[PDB]
Amino acid sequence: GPHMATGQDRVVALVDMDCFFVQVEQRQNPHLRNKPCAVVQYKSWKGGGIIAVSYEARAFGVTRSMWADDAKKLCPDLLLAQVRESRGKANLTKYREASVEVMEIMSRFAVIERAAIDEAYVDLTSAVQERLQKLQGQPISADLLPSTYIEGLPQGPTVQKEGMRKQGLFQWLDSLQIDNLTSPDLQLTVGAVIVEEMRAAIERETGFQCSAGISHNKVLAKLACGLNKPNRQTLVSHGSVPQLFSQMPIRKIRSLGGKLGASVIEILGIEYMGELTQFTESQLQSHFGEKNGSWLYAMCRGIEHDPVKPRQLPKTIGCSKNFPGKTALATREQVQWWLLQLAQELEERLTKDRNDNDRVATQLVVSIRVQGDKRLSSLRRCCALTRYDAHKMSHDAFTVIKNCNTSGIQTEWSPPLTMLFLCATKFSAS
DNA sequence: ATTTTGACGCT
Ligand SMILES: [Mg+2]
Ligand SMILES: [Mg+2]
Ligand SMILES: [Mg+2]
């Protein structure tokens, strides 16, 4: 009891831009605003592959990883914006630059960890301490939390969505003990006030709306963020965890959506995160390894210690192209031309990175796939990156892969290549 | 024939 650590030491937020690439295109083209629309890359094969979907289009069943032609079957009025194509390939620069806009706003409020192009974790512990001092024991008004849900409320003894939201927030604020500055529930509540202000700043200064989760760690913040989308934020308190986890499929927790979570389900014969509490830490370690076992033992109790890392910039700058079916590169000239295209985009992005961020990549990673291999990568080789020169980088990549050609013939490349990937890594200050 | 990314853990 008195020594049971409860994982209530931090306030952590996860901010997730709503249907991000779609909003970028809708800001640029007002005709797309408030319409079923999607972002598609390429157009020739089946109308293009959808990679982002507005909530209006999601209502028709349109999803990511859908061909545009099939999406149009579900949603005949679906509007489409195409990813830019440069040097023969999709180019995501517009979305990377929009991401920078949002990340730089978030960084004015607190230390952020860039988790993906459209999401960042925020460590709000210190900001919450400061705001609690500025308030002077003053109660927190519902008006400070106009888009916040309290997960698990209302409970106990209106039929509209905003009405339920307000009833739950009222119950929460009515229970709060605002005079105890060390109360974790109060700390989370102030965190949510700050996140309201952060999301308001993002929308005012970029036009982009986002959702957010506020809790005591990254996994719960991420889970909370998805509970009320779009354009809303959700507070998941420590006390809400038992009910929340009692019917939460294991695959919904970050890192359990794949083979490990499937093994948890199969080996333990359970379905819901909360069912994990009935195993000892040693039992979970025995099935899933020392680190996974300890992590699961604490996580099913709502506890995790993974820090919000101070990293606003990506650690790698990469570019890749698949060559599916019959487009597979079967000649040396082909391989060299496409290595050059990838290397030129990489050089452009690298030079911009060096100017903006005072750093230089030192390693070039080359990865290829050969036809007939279920693995995403068939071969991954590194070499030195000493000069931001596209021709040199393409030559080096060719040098490190050229012995993969099993063909005895001079030009022909066998087996044909279905993927090329150049990645700049190992940055150093400059 | 989703494609094009990005981070991290294992050995
Ligand atoms: Mg996201
Ligand atoms: Mg998103
Ligand atoms: Mg998504």
Q: Where are the beta strands (DSSP E) in A340-395?
A: 359-370, 379-384
CA nearest A323: which of A242, A209, A190, A421?
A421
Q: Which two tokens stand for residue A48?
A: 């293009």
AA letter at A101: E
Q: Which two tokens stand for residue A315?
A: 């650690």
CA to C1' distance (Å), from A49 to B1: 9
Contact (Cβ atoms closer than 8 angstroms) between residue A12 and residue A127: no
- List Cα–Cα distances, A98 to A61, A94, A104, A286, in angstroms: 27, 6, 10, 45
CA distance A276 to A288: 13
Q: Which two tokens stand for residue A125?
A: 């512990």
Cβ atoms within 10 Å of A163's Cβ, excluding its own: 11
Q: Which two tokens stand for residue A140?
A: 């927190």
CA distance A259 to A241: 24
CA distance A406 to A414: 5
- Residue with token string 């695959």: A251
Q: Relative to the alpha carbon of A120, which ligand is closest?
A: 1
Q: What is the DSSP letter of A63?
A: -
CA to C1' distance (Å), from A293 to B5: 30
Q: How far is the CA of A104 from the centre of ligand 2 (A)?
A: 17
Closest nucleotide to A255: CA versus each C1': B8
Annotated binding site of A for Mn(2+): 16-17, 118-119
Give phi and psi for A429, each to the nearest 5. -60, 145
CA distance A117 to A405: 35
Cβ atoms within 10 Å of A103's Cβ, excluding its own: 19
What value does the CA radius of gyration of chain A take, rounded to a whole number of Å? Answer: 25
Q: How far is the CA of A211 from the centre of ligand 1 (A)?
A: 9
A426: left (phi over 0), alpha (psi -120 to 50) or beta: left
Whether residue A242 has a cis bond before it, omega within 30° of 0: no
Give phi and psi for A234, each to the nearest 5. -130, 130
CA distance A34 to A231: 13
Q: Where are the domains of chain A?
A: 1-18+89-249, 19-88, 250-307, 308-430
**A9: helix, coil or strand?**
coil
Closest nucleotide to A316: CA versus each C1': B6
Whether residue A76 has a cis bond before it, omega within 30° of 0: no
- What DSSP string runs through A392-417? HHHHHHHHHHGGG----SSSEEEEEE
Contact (Cβ atoms closer than 8 angstroms) between residue A181 and residue A132: yes
Q: What is the DSSP letter of A311?
A: B
Q: Where are the beta strands (DSSP E) in A155-288?
A: 210-215, 233-235
Contact (Cβ atoms closer than 8 angstroms) between residue A66 and residue A46: no
Contact (Cβ atoms closer than 8 angstroms) between residue A168 and residue A149: yes
Q: How far is the CA of A409 from the centre of ligand 2 (A)?
A: 48
> How many residues are given for chain A?
430
Closest nucleotide to A349: CA versus each C1': B5
> How much of chain A is helix, strand and coil, in % rounded to 5?
45, 20, 35
Cβ atoms within 10 Å of A373's Cβ, excluding its own: 14
| Maximum distance among all Cα pairs of chain A, rounded to whole angstroms | 81
Contact (Cβ atoms closer than 8 angstroms) between residue A304 and residue A217: yes
Q: Where are the beta strands (DSSP E) in A137-276?
A: 148-150, 210-215, 233-235
Q: Where are the beta strands (DSSP E) in A134-242?
A: 148-150, 210-215, 233-235
Obtained via which technique? X-ray
CA nearest A62: which of A102, A35, A23, A88?
A35
Residues closing a segment before a gap in chain A (C–N exceeding 2.5 Å): 157
Q: Which two tokens stand for residue A243?
A: 């009910």
Q: What is the DSSP letter of A219?
A: H
- What DSSP string runs through A67-117? BHHHHHHH-TT-EEEEPPEETTEE--HHHHHHHHHHHHHHHHHS-EEEEET
Pairing relationship of beta strands A85-86 and A89-90 according to DSSP bridges = antiparallel
Q: What is the DSSP letter of A143?
A: G
CA to C1' distance (Å), from A160 to B7: 41
Q: Which residues have CB atoms below 7 Å from chain B, the nucleic strand?
A: A 41-42, 44-45, 49-51, 64-65, 89-92, 96, 114, 116-117, 289, 291-292, 309, 311, 314-322, 324-327, 345, 376, 419, 421, 423
Q: How far is the CA of A390 from the centre of ligand 2 (A)?
A: 33
CA to C1' distance (Å), from A176 to B3: 48
Kind and range of the H or E run holding A321:
strand A317-322
A291 contact partners, CB below 8 Å, separation of at least 6: none
Kind and range of the H or E run holding A361:
strand A359-370
Q: Which two tokens stand for residue A292?
A: 């996974």
Annotated binding site of A: 16-17, 64, 118-119
